[PDB]
Design a protein around this ligand. Structure first.
Ligand SMILES: Cc1cc(CNc2ncc(Br)c(Nc3cc(CCc4ccccc4)n[nH]3)n2)on1
Ligand SMILES: Cc1cc(CNc2ncc(Br)c(Nc3cc(CCc4ccccc4)n[nH]3)n2)on1
Lengths: 279, 279
Protein backbone atom coordinates (compact mmCIF):
# COMPACT_ATOMS: atom_id res chain seq x y z
CA UNK A 1 0.00 0.00 0.00
CA UNK A 2 0.05 1.83 -2.33
CA UNK A 3 2.64 -0.57 -3.95
CA UNK A 4 0.03 -2.85 -5.59
CA UNK A 5 -3.10 -0.74 -5.26
CA UNK A 6 -4.48 2.62 -4.17
CA UNK A 7 -7.70 2.86 -2.05
CA UNK A 8 -10.84 3.81 -3.97
CA UNK A 9 -12.91 7.06 -3.70
CA UNK A 10 -16.17 6.67 -5.71
CA UNK A 11 -16.84 10.46 -5.32
CA UNK A 12 -13.97 11.20 -7.81
CA UNK A 13 -13.39 7.91 -9.72
CA UNK A 14 -13.77 7.99 -13.53
CA UNK A 15 -13.73 4.73 -15.60
CA UNK A 16 -10.58 4.70 -17.78
CA UNK A 17 -12.74 4.21 -20.98
CA UNK A 18 -14.21 7.69 -20.45
CA UNK A 19 -10.71 9.29 -20.83
CA UNK A 20 -8.86 9.64 -24.14
CA UNK A 21 -5.27 10.75 -23.50
CA UNK A 22 -3.86 13.29 -25.96
CA UNK A 23 -0.79 15.52 -26.48
CA UNK A 24 1.72 16.19 -23.65
CA UNK A 25 1.32 19.75 -22.20
CA UNK A 26 4.48 19.86 -20.10
CA UNK A 27 6.02 18.94 -16.77
CA UNK A 28 4.27 19.93 -13.53
CA UNK A 29 4.92 19.37 -9.81
CA UNK A 30 5.16 15.59 -9.01
CA UNK A 31 4.89 14.35 -12.64
CA UNK A 32 3.87 15.01 -16.24
CA UNK A 33 0.75 16.81 -17.58
CA UNK A 34 -1.08 15.73 -20.77
CA UNK A 35 -4.14 17.12 -22.59
CA UNK A 36 -7.15 14.70 -22.65
CA UNK A 37 -10.86 14.38 -23.52
CA UNK A 38 -13.25 13.09 -20.80
CA UNK A 39 -16.87 11.89 -21.17
CA UNK A 40 -19.27 13.28 -18.53
CA UNK A 41 -17.27 14.45 -15.49
CA UNK A 42 -20.14 16.13 -13.53
CA UNK A 43 -23.08 13.22 -18.86
CA UNK A 44 -22.86 12.68 -22.68
CA UNK A 45 -20.76 15.91 -23.01
CA UNK A 46 -16.97 15.79 -23.74
CA UNK A 47 -14.63 18.13 -21.94
CA UNK A 48 -11.00 18.92 -22.77
CA UNK A 49 -9.13 18.31 -19.43
CA UNK A 50 -5.51 18.22 -18.11
CA UNK A 51 -4.23 14.95 -16.66
CA UNK A 52 -1.29 14.74 -14.23
CA UNK A 53 0.47 11.40 -13.95
CA UNK A 54 3.84 10.14 -12.72
CA UNK A 55 6.84 9.97 -15.10
CA UNK A 56 8.01 6.39 -16.00
CA UNK A 57 11.09 7.02 -13.76
CA UNK A 58 9.02 7.88 -10.61
CA UNK A 59 9.51 6.17 -7.20
CA UNK A 60 7.15 5.38 -4.28
CA UNK A 61 7.99 8.83 -2.83
CA UNK A 62 6.82 10.57 -6.09
CA UNK A 63 3.61 8.51 -6.02
CA UNK A 64 2.83 9.50 -2.35
CA UNK A 65 3.41 13.21 -3.31
CA UNK A 66 0.97 12.90 -6.26
CA UNK A 67 -1.68 11.19 -4.05
CA UNK A 68 -1.30 13.92 -1.34
CA UNK A 69 -1.74 16.69 -3.97
CA UNK A 70 -4.94 14.92 -5.20
CA UNK A 71 -6.17 14.49 -1.55
CA UNK A 72 -5.48 18.18 -0.80
CA UNK A 73 -7.42 19.25 -3.97
CA UNK A 74 -10.48 17.15 -2.80
CA UNK A 75 -10.26 19.06 0.58
CA UNK A 76 -9.87 22.57 -0.91
CA UNK A 77 -13.22 22.70 -2.73
CA UNK A 78 -14.27 24.61 -5.83
CA UNK A 79 -13.24 28.13 -6.88
CA UNK A 80 -13.31 29.87 -10.31
CA UNK A 81 -9.71 31.17 -9.78
CA UNK A 82 -7.94 27.92 -8.93
CA UNK A 83 -7.24 24.85 -11.08
CA UNK A 84 -10.06 22.54 -9.89
CA UNK A 85 -10.00 18.72 -9.45
CA UNK A 86 -12.47 17.03 -11.84
CA UNK A 87 -11.74 13.36 -11.31
CA UNK A 88 -9.25 10.51 -10.96
CA UNK A 89 -8.36 7.04 -12.33
CA UNK A 90 -6.80 5.34 -9.27
CA UNK A 91 -7.65 1.64 -9.81
CA UNK A 92 -6.05 -0.90 -12.18
CA UNK A 93 -3.30 1.19 -13.75
CA UNK A 94 -1.32 4.43 -13.41
CA UNK A 95 -2.76 7.22 -11.27
CA UNK A 96 -4.40 9.97 -13.40
CA UNK A 97 -5.24 13.21 -11.53
CA UNK A 98 -7.85 14.89 -13.85
CA UNK A 99 -8.16 18.68 -13.52
CA UNK A 100 -9.27 21.79 -15.46
CA UNK A 101 -7.54 22.61 -18.76
CA UNK A 102 -6.08 26.16 -19.09
CA UNK A 103 -5.40 26.47 -22.84
CA UNK A 104 -3.43 29.75 -22.78
CA UNK A 105 -0.63 28.45 -20.53
CA UNK A 106 1.06 30.18 -17.61
CA UNK A 107 0.46 33.90 -16.86
CA UNK A 108 4.16 34.93 -17.38
CA UNK A 109 4.13 33.48 -20.96
CA UNK A 110 0.59 34.86 -21.57
CA UNK A 111 1.64 38.45 -20.67
CA UNK A 112 4.93 38.28 -22.69
CA UNK A 113 3.15 37.10 -25.87
CA UNK A 114 0.83 40.18 -25.48
CA UNK A 115 3.59 42.81 -25.24
CA UNK A 116 3.53 45.62 -27.89
CA UNK A 117 -3.06 43.33 -26.75
CA UNK A 118 -3.97 43.81 -23.01
CA UNK A 119 -5.84 46.96 -21.76
CA UNK A 120 -5.23 48.54 -18.33
CA UNK A 121 -8.58 47.01 -17.24
CA UNK A 122 -7.47 43.49 -18.43
CA UNK A 123 -4.30 43.81 -16.30
CA UNK A 124 -6.19 44.93 -13.14
CA UNK A 125 -8.81 42.07 -13.74
CA UNK A 126 -5.94 39.60 -14.00
CA UNK A 127 -4.67 40.90 -10.55
CA UNK A 128 -8.22 40.86 -9.05
CA UNK A 129 -8.66 37.21 -10.16
CA UNK A 130 -5.33 36.03 -8.69
CA UNK A 131 -6.18 37.88 -5.41
CA UNK A 132 -9.63 36.15 -5.35
CA UNK A 133 -8.05 32.71 -5.87
CA UNK A 134 -5.46 33.51 -3.12
CA UNK A 135 -8.13 34.77 -0.71
CA UNK A 136 -10.04 31.48 -1.30
CA UNK A 137 -6.90 29.29 -0.75
CA UNK A 138 -6.02 31.31 2.39
CA UNK A 139 -9.55 30.68 3.84
CA UNK A 140 -8.97 26.92 3.20
CA UNK A 141 -5.83 27.28 5.43
CA UNK A 142 -3.60 26.85 2.39
CA UNK A 143 -0.14 28.59 2.21
CA UNK A 144 1.27 28.68 -1.29
CA UNK A 145 4.97 29.48 -0.44
CA UNK A 146 5.49 29.88 -4.29
CA UNK A 147 3.03 32.53 -5.68
CA UNK A 148 4.51 33.75 -9.05
CA UNK A 149 3.00 34.39 -12.52
CA UNK A 150 4.50 31.01 -13.69
CA UNK A 151 2.17 29.33 -11.12
CA UNK A 152 -0.95 30.95 -12.58
CA UNK A 153 -2.64 29.37 -15.61
CA UNK A 154 -4.91 31.16 -18.14
CA UNK A 155 -7.96 29.46 -19.73
CA UNK A 156 -9.39 29.95 -23.26
CA UNK A 157 -11.82 32.50 -21.70
CA UNK A 158 -8.96 34.47 -20.01
CA UNK A 159 -9.82 33.16 -16.49
CA UNK A 160 -6.81 33.26 -14.09
CA UNK A 161 -6.36 29.94 -12.25
CA UNK A 162 -3.73 29.46 -9.52
CA UNK A 163 -1.90 26.12 -9.91
CA UNK A 164 -0.40 25.56 -6.45
CA UNK A 165 -2.05 24.17 -3.29
CA UNK A 166 16.40 22.28 3.41
CA UNK A 167 14.86 24.37 0.54
CA UNK A 168 17.41 25.57 -2.11
CA UNK A 169 18.08 29.33 -2.64
CA UNK A 170 20.36 29.06 -5.73
CA UNK A 171 18.03 26.72 -7.79
CA UNK A 172 16.82 28.19 -11.13
CA UNK A 173 13.61 27.63 -13.20
CA UNK A 174 13.02 26.75 -16.94
CA UNK A 175 13.14 30.54 -17.79
CA UNK A 176 16.27 30.83 -15.54
CA UNK A 177 14.72 32.75 -12.59
CA UNK A 178 15.36 32.45 -8.80
CA UNK A 179 12.17 31.69 -6.68
CA UNK A 180 13.80 33.59 -3.73
CA UNK A 181 12.90 36.81 -5.68
CA UNK A 182 9.20 36.16 -4.81
CA UNK A 183 9.91 35.49 -1.08
CA UNK A 184 9.20 37.76 1.90
CA UNK A 185 12.28 38.55 4.08
CA UNK A 186 10.83 36.55 7.02
CA UNK A 187 10.35 33.46 4.78
CA UNK A 188 13.77 34.05 3.19
CA UNK A 189 15.72 34.59 6.47
CA UNK A 190 13.67 32.90 9.23
CA UNK A 191 11.81 30.24 7.15
CA UNK A 192 8.49 31.68 8.50
CA UNK A 193 5.71 31.04 5.92
CA UNK A 194 2.31 32.66 6.49
CA UNK A 195 -0.56 34.15 4.47
CA UNK A 196 1.27 37.50 4.99
CA UNK A 197 4.44 36.11 3.33
CA UNK A 198 2.18 35.07 0.36
CA UNK A 199 0.92 38.74 0.32
CA UNK A 200 4.57 39.84 -0.24
CA UNK A 201 4.75 37.30 -3.19
CA UNK A 202 1.46 38.73 -4.55
CA UNK A 203 3.16 42.18 -4.68
CA UNK A 204 5.97 40.64 -6.81
CA UNK A 205 3.27 38.98 -8.98
CA UNK A 206 1.58 42.48 -9.40
CA UNK A 207 4.99 43.80 -10.66
CA UNK A 208 5.12 40.85 -13.14
CA UNK A 209 1.62 41.75 -14.43
CA UNK A 210 2.44 45.45 -14.82
CA UNK A 211 5.80 44.74 -16.59
CA UNK A 212 3.91 42.21 -18.79
CA UNK A 213 5.97 39.22 -17.59
CA UNK A 214 9.08 41.16 -16.56
CA UNK A 215 11.95 39.56 -14.67
CA UNK A 216 12.38 40.67 -11.01
CA UNK A 217 15.74 42.10 -9.83
CA UNK A 218 17.54 41.14 -13.18
CA UNK A 219 21.27 40.48 -12.77
CA UNK A 220 20.96 40.58 -8.93
CA UNK A 221 22.56 37.47 -7.30
CA UNK A 222 20.92 35.75 -4.29
CA UNK A 223 23.47 37.25 -1.75
CA UNK A 224 22.96 40.83 -3.15
CA UNK A 225 19.11 40.44 -2.97
CA UNK A 226 19.48 39.73 0.80
CA UNK A 227 21.36 43.06 1.32
CA UNK A 228 18.91 45.09 -0.89
CA UNK A 229 15.87 43.80 1.07
CA UNK A 230 17.59 44.32 4.50
CA UNK A 231 18.48 47.90 3.21
CA UNK A 232 14.73 48.49 2.53
CA UNK A 233 15.27 48.55 -1.28
CA UNK A 234 12.18 47.81 -3.37
CA UNK A 235 11.61 47.25 -7.10
CA UNK A 236 10.84 50.29 -9.27
CA UNK A 237 7.37 51.33 -10.52
CA UNK A 238 6.71 49.55 -13.83
CA UNK A 239 6.27 51.91 -16.79
CA UNK A 240 2.60 52.97 -17.38
CA UNK A 241 1.54 51.45 -14.00
CA UNK A 242 -0.63 53.84 -11.86
CA UNK A 243 0.71 55.24 -8.55
CA UNK A 244 -2.30 53.56 -6.82
CA UNK A 245 -1.26 50.08 -8.10
CA UNK A 246 2.39 50.78 -7.19
CA UNK A 247 1.30 51.83 -3.67
CA UNK A 248 -0.50 48.43 -3.47
CA UNK A 249 2.80 46.63 -4.47
CA UNK A 250 4.72 48.68 -1.90
CA UNK A 251 2.08 47.89 0.79
CA UNK A 252 2.45 44.13 -0.04
CA UNK A 253 6.23 44.69 0.41
CA UNK A 254 6.01 46.21 3.94
CA UNK A 255 8.83 44.83 6.15
CA UNK A 256 6.32 44.19 9.03
CA UNK A 257 3.96 41.35 7.86
CA UNK A 258 1.06 42.70 10.01
CA UNK A 259 1.38 46.01 8.12
CA UNK A 260 0.89 44.33 4.72
CA UNK A 261 -2.76 44.20 3.51
CA UNK A 262 -4.62 40.87 3.82
CA UNK A 263 -5.88 38.99 0.67
CA UNK A 264 -9.45 40.02 1.73
CA UNK A 265 -8.39 43.75 1.61
CA UNK A 266 -6.52 43.24 -1.69
CA UNK A 267 -9.67 41.64 -3.23
CA UNK A 268 -11.90 44.63 -2.13
CA UNK A 269 -9.35 47.25 -3.36
CA UNK A 270 -8.84 45.40 -6.69
CA UNK A 271 -12.62 45.00 -7.18
CA UNK A 272 -13.04 48.79 -6.82
CA UNK A 273 -9.98 49.52 -9.07
CA UNK A 274 -11.26 47.13 -11.87
CA UNK A 275 -14.64 49.01 -12.01
CA UNK A 276 -12.84 52.40 -12.19
CA UNK A 277 -10.17 51.33 -14.76
CA UNK A 278 -10.72 52.05 -18.49
CA UNK A 279 -10.46 49.37 -21.22
CA UNK B 1 59.97 75.55 -9.39
CA UNK B 2 56.90 76.13 -11.58
CA UNK B 3 57.00 78.76 -14.41
CA UNK B 4 55.06 82.03 -13.81
CA UNK B 5 51.97 82.90 -15.86
CA UNK B 6 50.91 86.51 -15.12
CA UNK B 7 47.50 85.89 -16.77
CA UNK B 8 46.47 83.70 -13.75
CA UNK B 9 48.93 84.48 -10.92
CA UNK B 10 47.49 85.88 -7.61
CA UNK B 11 49.86 87.05 -4.78
CA UNK B 12 49.69 84.58 -1.77
CA UNK B 13 48.69 87.46 0.64
CA UNK B 14 45.49 87.96 -1.44
CA UNK B 15 44.21 84.55 -0.43
CA UNK B 16 42.85 83.75 3.02
CA UNK B 17 42.49 79.95 3.35
CA UNK B 18 39.39 78.76 5.21
CA UNK B 19 37.51 75.54 6.03
CA UNK B 20 38.26 72.24 4.18
CA UNK B 21 35.48 71.36 1.66
CA UNK B 22 36.59 67.80 0.87
CA UNK B 23 38.83 65.67 -1.33
CA UNK B 24 38.84 66.18 -5.10
CA UNK B 25 40.76 64.71 -8.04
CA UNK B 26 44.60 65.13 -7.56
CA UNK B 27 44.40 66.67 -4.03
CA UNK B 28 42.38 68.48 -1.35
CA UNK B 29 39.85 71.31 -1.73
CA UNK B 30 39.42 74.15 0.81
CA UNK B 31 37.08 77.18 0.92
CA UNK B 32 38.92 80.55 0.72
CA UNK B 33 38.63 84.31 0.31
CA UNK B 34 40.45 86.02 -2.50
CA UNK B 35 41.15 89.74 -2.16
CA UNK B 36 40.85 91.69 -5.44
CA UNK B 37 40.33 88.88 -8.01
CA UNK B 38 38.80 91.36 -10.55
CA UNK B 39 37.56 96.26 -7.41
CA UNK B 40 40.85 95.40 -5.53
CA UNK B 41 39.04 95.83 -2.14
CA UNK B 42 36.36 93.18 -2.75
CA UNK B 43 36.61 89.62 -1.34
CA UNK B 44 35.30 86.64 -3.30
CA UNK B 45 34.54 83.17 -1.85
CA UNK B 46 36.54 80.66 -3.97
CA UNK B 47 37.54 76.92 -3.88
CA UNK B 48 41.25 76.11 -3.70
CA UNK B 49 42.71 72.77 -4.80
CA UNK B 50 46.13 71.84 -3.43
CA UNK B 51 48.14 68.64 -2.98
CA UNK B 52 47.74 66.47 0.16
CA UNK B 53 50.93 66.21 2.37
CA UNK B 54 51.26 62.56 1.10
CA UNK B 55 51.25 63.52 -2.65
CA UNK B 56 53.96 62.31 -5.10
CA UNK B 57 55.72 63.93 -8.15
CA UNK B 58 52.98 62.23 -10.29
CA UNK B 59 50.29 63.93 -8.12
CA UNK B 60 51.95 67.38 -8.68
CA UNK B 61 52.24 66.87 -12.51
CA UNK B 62 48.54 65.76 -12.60
CA UNK B 63 47.50 68.94 -10.63
CA UNK B 64 49.55 71.19 -12.99
CA UNK B 65 48.04 69.48 -16.11
CA UNK B 66 44.47 69.94 -14.77
CA UNK B 67 45.29 73.68 -14.20
CA UNK B 68 46.89 73.95 -17.72
CA UNK B 69 43.88 72.31 -19.34
CA UNK B 70 41.43 74.66 -17.50
CA UNK B 71 43.41 77.70 -18.87
CA UNK B 72 42.91 76.40 -22.46
CA UNK B 73 39.19 75.37 -22.17
CA UNK B 74 37.78 78.85 -21.71
CA UNK B 75 34.72 80.05 -19.81
CA UNK B 76 31.29 78.40 -19.54
CA UNK B 77 28.45 78.86 -16.98
CA UNK B 78 28.07 75.02 -16.66
CA UNK B 79 31.66 74.08 -15.89
CA UNK B 80 33.82 74.84 -12.82
CA UNK B 81 35.93 77.76 -14.11
CA UNK B 82 39.57 78.60 -13.25
CA UNK B 83 39.93 81.96 -11.45
CA UNK B 84 43.60 82.04 -10.52
CA UNK B 85 46.73 80.33 -9.12
CA UNK B 86 49.55 80.71 -6.53
CA UNK B 87 52.44 78.86 -8.23
CA UNK B 88 55.52 80.72 -6.91
CA UNK B 89 57.25 80.43 -3.49
CA UNK B 90 55.09 77.78 -1.80
CA UNK B 91 52.51 75.03 -2.41
CA UNK B 92 50.53 75.14 -5.67
CA UNK B 93 47.02 76.59 -5.15
CA UNK B 94 44.58 76.10 -8.08
CA UNK B 95 41.84 78.74 -7.43
CA UNK B 96 38.42 78.02 -9.00
CA UNK B 97 34.68 78.78 -8.64
CA UNK B 98 33.02 77.94 -5.34
CA UNK B 99 29.87 75.68 -5.62
CA UNK B 100 28.32 75.96 -2.15
CA UNK B 101 25.72 73.16 -2.51
CA UNK B 102 28.25 70.38 -3.14
CA UNK B 103 28.03 67.51 -5.62
CA UNK B 104 24.82 66.76 -7.59
CA UNK B 105 24.36 63.22 -6.12
CA UNK B 106 24.35 64.60 -2.53
CA UNK B 107 22.23 67.63 -3.64
CA UNK B 108 19.48 65.38 -5.11
CA UNK B 109 19.49 62.95 -2.11
CA UNK B 110 19.08 65.77 0.43
CA UNK B 111 15.99 66.89 -1.60
CA UNK B 112 14.20 63.52 -1.55
CA UNK B 113 10.73 63.50 0.11
CA UNK B 114 11.32 62.59 3.82
CA UNK B 115 16.96 67.80 4.45
CA UNK B 116 16.32 70.43 1.76
CA UNK B 117 13.27 71.59 -0.28
CA UNK B 118 11.75 69.19 -2.87
CA UNK B 119 12.62 69.69 -6.54
CA UNK B 120 9.89 69.96 -9.17
CA UNK B 121 9.86 67.89 -12.40
CA UNK B 122 10.90 71.10 -14.22
CA UNK B 123 13.90 71.61 -11.81
CA UNK B 124 15.08 68.05 -12.60
CA UNK B 125 14.86 68.51 -16.37
CA UNK B 126 16.61 71.92 -16.04
CA UNK B 127 19.43 70.26 -14.07
CA UNK B 128 19.84 67.69 -16.96
CA UNK B 129 19.65 70.57 -19.56
CA UNK B 130 22.51 72.42 -17.71
CA UNK B 131 24.79 69.34 -17.51
CA UNK B 132 24.11 68.70 -21.26
CA UNK B 133 25.02 72.39 -22.00
CA UNK B 134 28.31 72.08 -20.06
CA UNK B 135 29.08 68.80 -21.89
CA UNK B 136 28.22 70.29 -25.28
CA UNK B 137 30.65 73.17 -24.49
CA UNK B 138 33.48 70.74 -23.45
CA UNK B 139 32.82 68.60 -26.57
CA UNK B 140 33.15 71.75 -28.82
CA UNK B 141 36.55 72.40 -27.14
CA UNK B 142 37.50 68.83 -28.31
CA UNK B 143 37.47 67.71 -24.68
CA UNK B 144 36.49 64.14 -23.62
CA UNK B 145 35.35 63.89 -19.99
CA UNK B 146 35.72 60.03 -19.44
CA UNK B 147 34.08 60.29 -15.94
CA UNK B 148 30.69 62.03 -16.22
CA UNK B 149 28.62 61.10 -13.08
CA UNK B 150 26.44 63.17 -10.70
CA UNK B 151 29.36 63.07 -8.14
CA UNK B 152 31.43 65.04 -10.74
CA UNK B 153 28.83 67.80 -11.04
CA UNK B 154 28.85 70.61 -8.46
CA UNK B 155 25.90 72.87 -7.55
CA UNK B 156 26.29 76.63 -6.72
CA UNK B 157 24.28 78.71 -4.20
CA UNK B 158 22.11 79.75 -7.19
CA UNK B 159 21.45 76.12 -8.26
CA UNK B 160 23.78 76.34 -11.30
CA UNK B 161 25.10 72.90 -12.43
CA UNK B 162 28.89 72.95 -12.95
CA UNK B 163 30.85 70.04 -14.36
CA UNK B 164 34.16 69.32 -12.63
CA UNK B 165 37.19 67.07 -13.50
CA UNK B 166 37.16 67.34 -17.34
CA UNK B 167 37.24 47.62 -12.31
CA UNK B 168 36.53 46.78 -8.61
CA UNK B 169 37.62 50.13 -7.01
CA UNK B 170 34.85 51.91 -5.01
CA UNK B 171 34.24 55.64 -4.35
CA UNK B 172 33.58 57.17 -0.85
CA UNK B 173 29.84 56.30 -1.33
CA UNK B 174 30.68 52.65 -2.28
CA UNK B 175 29.78 52.99 -6.01
CA UNK B 176 31.67 51.38 -8.92
CA UNK B 177 32.75 53.96 -11.67
CA UNK B 178 32.41 51.12 -14.28
CA UNK B 179 28.61 51.62 -13.91
CA UNK B 180 28.92 54.96 -15.82
CA UNK B 181 31.10 53.50 -18.60
CA UNK B 182 30.05 52.68 -22.20
CA UNK B 183 30.80 49.01 -23.21
CA UNK B 184 33.49 50.15 -25.70
CA UNK B 185 35.23 52.23 -22.96
CA UNK B 186 34.75 49.33 -20.46
CA UNK B 187 36.01 46.54 -22.75
CA UNK B 188 38.25 48.23 -25.36
CA UNK B 189 39.35 51.40 -23.43
CA UNK B 190 37.95 53.52 -26.33
CA UNK B 191 36.85 56.96 -24.98
CA UNK B 192 34.93 59.31 -27.33
CA UNK B 193 32.22 62.01 -27.05
CA UNK B 194 29.79 59.08 -27.75
CA UNK B 195 31.09 57.16 -24.69
CA UNK B 196 30.49 60.39 -22.62
CA UNK B 197 26.90 60.41 -24.07
CA UNK B 198 26.46 56.87 -22.59
CA UNK B 199 27.66 58.29 -19.17
CA UNK B 200 25.19 61.21 -19.55
CA UNK B 201 22.38 58.61 -19.87
CA UNK B 202 23.48 57.09 -16.53
CA UNK B 203 23.62 60.63 -15.06
CA UNK B 204 19.97 61.21 -16.32
CA UNK B 205 18.94 58.05 -14.41
CA UNK B 206 20.71 59.44 -11.29
CA UNK B 207 18.77 62.73 -11.61
CA UNK B 208 15.40 61.00 -12.06
CA UNK B 209 16.02 58.60 -9.10
CA UNK B 210 17.15 61.69 -7.06
CA UNK B 211 20.70 60.35 -6.55
CA UNK B 212 19.98 56.65 -6.93
CA UNK B 213 22.80 54.11 -7.21
CA UNK B 214 23.07 52.61 -10.76
CA UNK B 215 22.45 48.82 -11.22
CA UNK B 216 21.68 48.18 -7.48
CA UNK B 217 22.85 44.76 -6.29
CA UNK B 218 24.62 44.07 -9.63
CA UNK B 219 28.32 42.99 -9.22
CA UNK B 220 31.02 44.14 -11.76
CA UNK B 221 31.14 40.71 -13.57
CA UNK B 222 27.30 40.55 -13.87
CA UNK B 223 27.20 44.15 -15.30
CA UNK B 224 29.57 42.99 -18.12
CA UNK B 225 27.17 40.11 -18.87
CA UNK B 226 23.99 42.31 -18.82
CA UNK B 227 25.52 44.97 -21.12
CA UNK B 228 26.84 42.42 -23.67
CA UNK B 229 23.36 40.81 -23.83
CA UNK B 230 21.71 44.24 -24.33
CA UNK B 231 20.21 44.71 -20.86
CA UNK B 232 19.61 48.24 -19.62
CA UNK B 233 18.50 49.94 -16.36
CA UNK B 234 14.76 50.21 -15.65
CA UNK B 235 12.96 53.44 -16.06
CA UNK B 236 13.14 55.37 -12.71
CA UNK B 237 9.74 55.26 -10.86
CA UNK B 238 9.23 59.06 -11.48
CA UNK B 239 10.24 59.50 -15.12
CA UNK B 240 8.28 60.20 -18.33
CA UNK B 241 8.56 57.68 -21.24
CA UNK B 242 10.11 60.51 -23.33
CA UNK B 243 12.96 61.01 -20.79
CA UNK B 244 13.44 57.22 -20.51
CA UNK B 245 13.64 56.99 -24.32
CA UNK B 246 16.39 59.68 -24.14
CA UNK B 247 18.35 57.58 -21.54
CA UNK B 248 17.89 54.44 -23.72
CA UNK B 249 19.09 56.38 -26.81
CA UNK B 250 22.24 57.45 -24.82
CA UNK B 251 22.67 53.71 -24.06
CA UNK B 252 22.65 52.59 -27.77
CA UNK B 253 25.05 49.60 -28.32
CA UNK B 254 26.36 51.25 -31.56
CA UNK B 255 28.07 54.52 -30.48
CA UNK B 256 27.27 56.18 -33.85
CA UNK B 257 23.48 55.84 -33.03
CA UNK B 258 23.62 57.69 -29.71
CA UNK B 259 22.39 61.32 -29.78
CA UNK B 260 25.12 63.99 -29.73
CA UNK B 261 25.37 66.53 -26.84
CA UNK B 262 24.12 69.21 -29.33
CA UNK B 263 20.91 67.10 -29.92
CA UNK B 264 20.53 66.39 -26.18
CA UNK B 265 20.75 70.17 -25.45
CA UNK B 266 17.99 70.99 -28.06
CA UNK B 267 15.70 68.13 -26.87
CA UNK B 268 16.21 69.08 -23.17
CA UNK B 269 15.60 72.80 -23.92
CA UNK B 270 12.22 71.87 -25.53
CA UNK B 271 11.35 69.37 -22.70
CA UNK B 272 12.17 72.00 -19.94
CA UNK B 273 9.67 74.48 -21.55
CA UNK B 274 6.96 71.78 -21.71
CA UNK B 275 7.56 70.37 -18.17
CA UNK B 276 5.43 71.66 -15.26
CA UNK B 277 6.87 73.11 -12.02
CA UNK B 278 3.50 72.30 -10.29
CA UNK B 279 4.81 68.84 -9.11
C1 LIG C 1 1.60 25.44 -13.58
C2 LIG C 1 1.60 24.20 -14.37
C3 LIG C 1 1.86 24.07 -15.76
C4 LIG C 1 1.74 22.72 -16.02
C5 LIG C 1 1.87 21.94 -17.27
N1 LIG C 1 2.43 22.72 -18.36
C6 LIG C 1 1.47 23.27 -19.23
N2 LIG C 1 1.93 23.86 -20.34
C7 LIG C 1 1.03 24.39 -21.18
C8 LIG C 1 -0.32 24.35 -20.93
BR1 LIG C 1 -1.51 25.11 -22.20
C9 LIG C 1 -0.72 23.75 -19.75
N3 LIG C 1 -2.09 23.71 -19.43
C10 LIG C 1 -2.69 23.27 -18.28
C11 LIG C 1 -2.06 22.69 -17.14
C12 LIG C 1 -3.08 22.42 -16.26
C13 LIG C 1 -3.20 21.87 -14.90
C14 LIG C 1 -1.95 21.25 -14.32
C15 LIG C 1 -2.19 20.91 -12.86
C16 LIG C 1 -2.20 21.90 -11.89
C17 LIG C 1 -2.43 21.59 -10.56
C18 LIG C 1 -2.64 20.28 -10.18
C19 LIG C 1 -2.63 19.29 -11.14
C20 LIG C 1 -2.41 19.61 -12.47
N4 LIG C 1 -4.22 22.83 -16.88
N5 LIG C 1 -4.01 23.36 -18.09
N6 LIG C 1 0.16 23.20 -18.92
O1 LIG C 1 1.43 22.09 -14.85
N7 LIG C 1 1.34 23.01 -13.81
C1 LIG D 1 33.79 67.08 -7.56
C2 LIG D 1 34.60 67.68 -6.48
C3 LIG D 1 34.22 67.87 -5.13
C4 LIG D 1 35.32 68.45 -4.54
C5 LIG D 1 35.60 68.91 -3.16
N1 LIG D 1 34.55 68.56 -2.19
C6 LIG D 1 33.57 69.55 -1.99
N2 LIG D 1 32.70 69.30 -0.99
C7 LIG D 1 31.76 70.22 -0.73
C8 LIG D 1 31.66 71.38 -1.45
BR1 LIG D 1 30.32 72.64 -0.97
C9 LIG D 1 32.56 71.55 -2.51
N3 LIG D 1 32.46 72.70 -3.30
C10 LIG D 1 33.27 73.11 -4.32
C11 LIG D 1 34.29 72.32 -4.93
C12 LIG D 1 34.80 73.12 -5.93
C13 LIG D 1 35.84 72.96 -6.97
C14 LIG D 1 36.72 71.74 -6.86
C15 LIG D 1 37.79 71.81 -7.90
C16 LIG D 1 37.61 71.17 -9.11
C17 LIG D 1 38.60 71.23 -10.08
C18 LIG D 1 39.77 71.92 -9.83
C19 LIG D 1 39.95 72.56 -8.62
C20 LIG D 1 38.97 72.49 -7.65
N4 LIG D 1 34.12 74.29 -5.86
N5 LIG D 1 33.16 74.30 -4.93
N6 LIG D 1 33.52 70.65 -2.76
O1 LIG D 1 36.29 68.59 -5.48
N7 LIG D 1 35.84 68.12 -6.71
Amino acid sequence: VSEYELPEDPRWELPRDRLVLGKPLGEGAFGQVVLAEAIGLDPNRVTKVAVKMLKSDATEKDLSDLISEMEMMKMIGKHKNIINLLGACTQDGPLYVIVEYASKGNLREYLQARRPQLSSKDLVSCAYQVARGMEYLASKKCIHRDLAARNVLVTEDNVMKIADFHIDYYKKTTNGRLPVKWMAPEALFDRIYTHQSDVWSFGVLLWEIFTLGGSPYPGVPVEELFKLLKEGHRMDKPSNCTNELYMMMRDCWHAVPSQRPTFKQLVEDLDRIVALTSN
